[PDB]
Short mmCIF file of C-alpha atoms in Angstrom, two decimals:
data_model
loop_
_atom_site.label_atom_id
_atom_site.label_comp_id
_atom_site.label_asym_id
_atom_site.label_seq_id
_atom_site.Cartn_x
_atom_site.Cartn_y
_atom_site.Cartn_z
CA UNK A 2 -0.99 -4.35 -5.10
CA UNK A 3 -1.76 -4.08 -1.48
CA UNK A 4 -2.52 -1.57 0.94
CA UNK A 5 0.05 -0.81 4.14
CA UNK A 6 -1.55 2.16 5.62
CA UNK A 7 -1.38 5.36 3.75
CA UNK A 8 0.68 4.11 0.77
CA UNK A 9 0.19 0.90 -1.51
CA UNK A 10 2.74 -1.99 -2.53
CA UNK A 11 2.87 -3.56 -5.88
#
Protein backbone atom coordinates (compact mmCIF):
# COMPACT_ATOMS: atom_id res chain seq x y z
CA UNK A 1 0.00 0.00 0.00
CA UNK A 2 0.65 3.62 -0.45
CA UNK A 3 -0.16 6.73 1.10
CA UNK A 4 -2.46 9.59 -0.87
CA UNK A 5 -2.94 12.06 1.82
CA UNK A 6 -5.16 11.15 4.66
CA UNK A 7 -6.17 7.67 3.43
CA UNK A 8 -3.94 4.69 2.06
CA UNK A 9 -4.23 2.53 -1.29
CA UNK A 10 -3.56 -1.10 -1.49
Amino acid sequence: CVWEGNKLHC
